[PDB]
């Protein structure tokens, strides 16, 4: 009986950060309430100042990561303010029935709705907008995120021993298809409704103009690099709602990887690079052994270094020469 | 001694349906005879009335699914009527030797041949035409199907307990590369021999013009949606002879997935989306928990909703509110 | 203490061959010294005589395969002669820290350097050049190879029983992006520095002009096909530094496949085709059961047969009719 369950309200954080949660559940099954407000906005996505009309959950690309446990109930209230122009909805890959909630959540601007579903399967999953006849348009404009459904006893390794992470980050990778003039210059629009027909043409090439982490080229660099220390255990959640990607930590590994993101499966060990199919969320666990700068990339290196799919980790701590050392520094021969 | 074995003749059905078979073998090893007749024909592949010259096994795209057990012998008689214009053959990914049968099955129009091979490895596999110097041309014109080699004791889960399916469907996904005029209009040809040189140019872009299930855009919709009921266990066999795909059931999951299609491996559990490499057949097992319409798609959503890679399931039965419910229907805010 | 360890010098061979090594280590942990000399050169990559400026490790595409055991130390001396024009470096996916060695190995022409790292994780891994701001350029010009880190007790099957291979081959697959004139003709340059800006434009289409094994179209054919005999156990190491590939042996299988190349994981069994993500090395083990010609391909068949990703195996020995036979040879109907 659902009225007898505990309720908890969770206030969501902006990616790549993740809202507070427990790995091992310290309570029984709850009804966990979240609220998201849809926000259509102008977004500057590269260093040349290219501008798209983004469709966002809670004003970010990607949408924020929601974290529950297995057999909790998720109760999302979804708000479309009348300052938006389009009909929107939500489809949870984590849910069972009604096109993932899509059929039940259709909100015109100035409407709201509340959905409940039981999270019956543990793993990281994609959520995304999916209105009838305009699904790729909304998803490739940034209207996607993820949800993590932890097992009630947390994560385990390929042996079934606990794996406890010290930090967790969420990396949403997004393929944009910006329309181009005859000479290849990026076009600009005043309304998202304006862009539509050119967007369909652009998408149909299957060749994105940009692929970025956290909504912009260099969004996870320098000032905004991800931080860790040597000896910390980090979980990186990574989603792609529409296209395949192949993550890789430069100077590191995926010690434990769930490449298709479902925790009832044993992880893959010692991965250099892993494939996350389009429409999936995955997770990699790593213990940092060395300090310094790392690059985290999609390892189609054209997609990384030309199109924008690259971020940084800056890691404090002691250097270990047994692992690696320069015997002879670069010198005249 | 092969003359002492039982023979059985099987008459094949048109996809997405599958010919009658036993999951658990009720006989010892058999020689199972099938016949296929090749058919070059005109095919209308989208709602605008675009026409290709298809090269088919038994008049369908995809070719029909053949079902045997491990260590049965497959004896295929292959017929190329003199109403066709090209040389054809067959390559079974399930077989060992002679380029999968390709080297032994080269038939000019008005020829026939019979091949036998032992099915030594259990799984779903691709078969396809592969004549010398024209292989992608024949495969991307629709000349591919699959064969399922069941273990003699049927399917098992990640624990080795029986998995029994109630229904089974075969979804062949096909990338077409239709040649285009200077303005991007789809060209038309009278003979397949006419199309050849433009086809090579089209294929070389690596960008398909269409990606469809069962030979046409919307072939598995409305009138022709796949059916099931709540509580039935359904096996979906899905092949792609030439290009990667990433299936996903909208509103559902792959409870048990063999993404690369080989049953001696344990399945992957609780998959939202899975990757089937080009040149492979895979299989997903699902128990429907809710009634209603589901969409089954390639989850590059551009490929699904713009290019044609989408089908429907319509599922009869009782709704379960514990799994999902609308708390507040979309309403004025 | 590292000064007390044995040293061994290994002289590397040109792919697809692999330098002598032991599967089971007959010594304790060693410091294994290799030397590579970088070589920028002109390369003819197809039968039309298209010419690129290749950037190579030791004069080949791919670079040679290095073979060590787990917890050996790799000590590479890297030489950039002053007959080259670019700055280069090396990034080992097998190593931990300093962007895989990249940060420590930056050598201008006429410089050298020596790197040591401990190989702490068993598997096949990619190595490649990765200088700041020009990474895809160097990698797609051919500046990549692989290293195999065997477990000290060699390979095991999904049960943990020994797997011993009789032969081993290394197949490096390379995507080239040759720049094209307005009419689609392949341009030619005198210096690699000349090509740069057109290369960036070419790469950004994400559509390679060629995809080849061992540096050229038909490099592993006829004269240069890979050899084996019926009953031999062959290990095929296959890498792609930048783009996904889907290997497949025509007429055969991957009896045991590590598709992401890491040996602490159990292999996948009976694979028809497997996915190697871009930025990864994988390995397939097969026992040949039949003699004759086999084709080994990327099973996007356009990529194989139009763009160059196809090689041959020619296999001596006795034919087994129980596995496959022609009952009726192609004949008039
Ligand atoms: O080794 N990273 O490109
Ligand atoms: O959740 N399906 O696109
Ligand atoms: O069956 N090989 O294309
Ligand atoms: Cu939307
Ligand atoms: Cu989806
Ligand atoms: Cu054919
Ligand atoms: Cu094939
Ligand atoms: Cu270089
Ligand atoms: Cu790399």
JSON list of C-alpha atoms and ligand atoms in Angstrom, two decimals, chain A residues 248-251 272-273 297 299 301 305, chain C residues 91-93 99 126-130 135 139 241-242 278-280, ligand 9:
[
{"chain": "A", "resi": 248, "resn": "UNK", "atom": "CA", "xyz": [38.36, 6.38, -22.66]},
{"chain": "A", "resi": 249, "resn": "UNK", "atom": "CA", "xyz": [40.42, 7.96, -19.81]},
{"chain": "A", "resi": 250, "resn": "UNK", "atom": "CA", "xyz": [43.78, 9.10, -21.20]},
{"chain": "A", "resi": 251, "resn": "UNK", "atom": "CA", "xyz": [46.45, 7.87, -18.75]},
{"chain": "A", "resi": 272, "resn": "UNK", "atom": "CA", "xyz": [40.99, 0.75, -22.14]},
{"chain": "A", "resi": 273, "resn": "UNK", "atom": "CA", "xyz": [37.94, 1.98, -24.10]},
{"chain": "A", "resi": 297, "resn": "UNK", "atom": "CA", "xyz": [37.31, 11.47, -24.40]},
{"chain": "A", "resi": 299, "resn": "UNK", "atom": "CA", "xyz": [37.86, 7.70, -28.67]},
{"chain": "A", "resi": 301, "resn": "UNK", "atom": "CA", "xyz": [39.60, 11.12, -31.86]},
{"chain": "A", "resi": 305, "resn": "UNK", "atom": "CA", "xyz": [39.42, 16.84, -30.69]},
{"chain": "C", "resi": 91, "resn": "UNK", "atom": "CA", "xyz": [50.68, 7.27, -25.61]},
{"chain": "C", "resi": 92, "resn": "UNK", "atom": "CA", "xyz": [50.34, 3.68, -24.37]},
{"chain": "C", "resi": 93, "resn": "UNK", "atom": "CA", "xyz": [46.76, 2.64, -23.52]},
{"chain": "C", "resi": 99, "resn": "UNK", "atom": "CA", "xyz": [48.48, 10.75, -20.66]},
{"chain": "C", "resi": 126, "resn": "UNK", "atom": "CA", "xyz": [46.48, 0.34, -28.58]},
{"chain": "C", "resi": 127, "resn": "UNK", "atom": "CA", "xyz": [49.48, 2.63, -28.64]},
{"chain": "C", "resi": 128, "resn": "UNK", "atom": "CA", "xyz": [49.52, 5.81, -30.75]},
{"chain": "C", "resi": 129, "resn": "UNK", "atom": "CA", "xyz": [51.04, 9.23, -31.26]},
{"chain": "C", "resi": 130, "resn": "UNK", "atom": "CA", "xyz": [49.16, 12.08, -29.63]},
{"chain": "C", "resi": 135, "resn": "UNK", "atom": "CA", "xyz": [46.15, 14.16, -32.32]},
{"chain": "C", "resi": 139, "resn": "UNK", "atom": "CA", "xyz": [46.69, 8.85, -35.64]},
{"chain": "C", "resi": 241, "resn": "UNK", "atom": "CA", "xyz": [42.93, 3.41, -32.95]},
{"chain": "C", "resi": 242, "resn": "UNK", "atom": "CA", "xyz": [40.15, 5.77, -34.12]},
{"chain": "C", "resi": 278, "resn": "UNK", "atom": "CA", "xyz": [37.54, 2.69, -31.90]},
{"chain": "C", "resi": 279, "resn": "UNK", "atom": "CA", "xyz": [40.50, 3.16, -29.58]},
{"chain": "C", "resi": 280, "resn": "UNK", "atom": "CA", "xyz": [40.72, -0.56, -28.67]},
{"chain": "D", "resi": 9, "resn": "LIG", "atom": "CU1", "xyz": [44.13, 6.79, -27.11]}
]
